[PDB]
Design a protein around this nucleic acid. Sequence first.
RNA 1: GGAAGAAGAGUUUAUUCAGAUAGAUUUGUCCGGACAAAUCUAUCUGAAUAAACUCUUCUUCGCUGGAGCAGCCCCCGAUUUGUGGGGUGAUUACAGC
Length: 737
Amino acid sequence: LSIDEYQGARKWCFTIAFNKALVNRDKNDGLFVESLLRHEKYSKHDWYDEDTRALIKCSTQAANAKAEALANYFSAYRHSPGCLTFTAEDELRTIMERAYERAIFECRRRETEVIIEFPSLFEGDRITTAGVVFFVSFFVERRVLDRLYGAVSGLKKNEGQYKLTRKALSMYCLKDSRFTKAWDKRVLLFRDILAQLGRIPAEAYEYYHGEQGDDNEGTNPKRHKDKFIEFALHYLEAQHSEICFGRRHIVRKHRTKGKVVVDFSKKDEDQSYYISKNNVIVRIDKNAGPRSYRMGLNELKYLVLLSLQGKGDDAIAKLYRYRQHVENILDVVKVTDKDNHVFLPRFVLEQHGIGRKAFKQRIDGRVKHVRGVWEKKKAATNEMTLHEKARDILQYVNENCTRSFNPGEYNRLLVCLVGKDVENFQAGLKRLQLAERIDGRVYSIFAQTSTINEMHQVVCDQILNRLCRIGDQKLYDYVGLGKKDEIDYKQKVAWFKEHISIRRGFLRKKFWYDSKKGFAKLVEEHLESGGGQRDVGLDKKYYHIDAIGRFEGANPALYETLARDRLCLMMAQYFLGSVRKELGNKIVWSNDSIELPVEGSVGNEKSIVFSVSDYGKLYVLDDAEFLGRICEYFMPHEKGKIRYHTVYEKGFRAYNDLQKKCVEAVLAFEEKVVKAKKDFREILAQTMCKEAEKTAVNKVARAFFAHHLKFVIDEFGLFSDVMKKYGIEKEWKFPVK
RNA sequence: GGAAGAAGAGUUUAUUCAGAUAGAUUUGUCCGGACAAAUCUAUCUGAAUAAACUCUUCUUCGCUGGAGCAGCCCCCGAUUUGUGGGGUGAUUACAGC
């Protein structure tokens, strides 16, 4: 349809389409892959062949150059004549044919019409408008593609074949609706954190909804375990760069047996952190060299809280200093003061003579503790599990035996005891008695008993009797105070220097010195003031018990579980608000919404409102200051909180209607001035207008070209009058619109 | 009616997503017309993360010496997890039979 003849001002609608394609490419380069993989990525089956899939995956970043080249040719009448023609040798021409064939086959699966072939062929090296619209189908949304499919293109003419042509070209296009990116890591963290935070604590579930006898996870779940540490470590890694915690892996007498090794490699996703009784290992790498420490939960929660206030990084610096200070103390142990005294462990201080304890007090402390443990075990006979009882009974036999039991023999005896086959135990005792490994007294005392409870009671009686016997050196041997020390001091000091740990409560004294408030008050004040502006979904019924006294009962536990849980809430926000880099810092959270405030008047009413799903990067979303500008210049009357859909449906239409009429006029002016005269603002430079006015007109043109507006108000009037000078005038009602 | 760890097989519970099917509202295109987007309300498939519950296979379950600056427990107080004072015959970033 005179595709080559179509030139000059008669064809300008492609210009804005390619300008939009450029800004879409700037937002995301992967849109090409997404459009090519629309039906396969989130679905079970792929109609693409393996070779076609390999071609699509390998073909990346080359197509955008071709798109940019075509945009330049369509943009200007002056230059770039040979861009349109392309060789059939190109692989892009192969993948286009494959995709078009698959799409037309899918449309033919609709068996309504097969009579007429849909035209999409490119004649030899040249490409028709069908090829151009098919190519620009990628990188754009549905509505712009429909507008370009309008009467501007000659294909729009309605026939019986028209509907199938509309479907085939639009097959690989993406709707301007959300199409939210959902497989990102941060979103999958946020959803699970919220879901787990919506669960009943165990202790409160035991009573409030507690049943006299006890569905399960069915209706109102119970959180069996707490996962505060896993989320806190993820947040700490995400926020800062230096910190990377240790991780554990498994790979492969007591020789060459597989033993877990703590390593700091981040290559494998399967690696899980190393937490054993609420201890972690941290790495601080900066400046001269790496360093490391181990920390408890108490110093972890304070740092996690400190980061959110915005002072976190400085705190990390203090950790870097800590080790050095300890070194100084090791030189001045005798000289230094009490504050440095609390830093060093016991054995270091004991050598200098400080903290020595009398032997008799040690004996008295040890013996009563051991006797209390053993008398508790006596009352706990039936309650304990078989695993504990078997070890308890075997301990007496192994202690009585003169020769240390072989590790291999231990397992079979443990299996025999746990199997309730006490006869095998008796047989083993008889076998060991003959060689005299074990005393015959144990065999005599064990023979009568027939149940594990009876044997446990017998053993407890013997242990209590032997503890009851008068003081002797055998008592010291049995309690373990008799052992001597044969290791030099220097090796122990070297080991201690190799392995250091942080004092408990170190962070709290440094900054919150004057504070009288506890943990909960400190969390709650920042939650109310800094802008959490939310509370956990659970009612205060579960987190407190009214009947029992406040201090009495299990209430001291739950009152803390709330105080930490609030912190978790804030962390979840950081995993969603950080999706966008440009905005997301000015964003303010409020009651399950996300609001972006625009000052405007001194009274703030120009705020815009997103939902959680809307903030997920739909194609409609953009940068920050452009929103304020489009609100200022267009639709001034509306005030108050505005749903983003209203701005989307109002401002963008006015912007497009203005821009099309502006660009067509400027192109016509360029053509006319080029004809009258007989790139890079050469015409505007030729104009007798002032250089400031040249800058104004080219700035106004390039602003509408780049889809962002930053020009001042006065420039548009100058552009209007200079355009009027050439004799072509049209009114767009831009100001006070 | 043994305990932890690993590999594997599943099972069902609650939130998200993609492609399709209807209803209302609303906007803009064409010579009253269909169409094109959107926001809510129901329908059908499929996919991913999390929690719990079964089954199969395997692996380890000892003794000696140093460490309690870290993790646990009792006194003493408290809108509560405290650089207030006393224990823990060791839980291990470890070394030897």
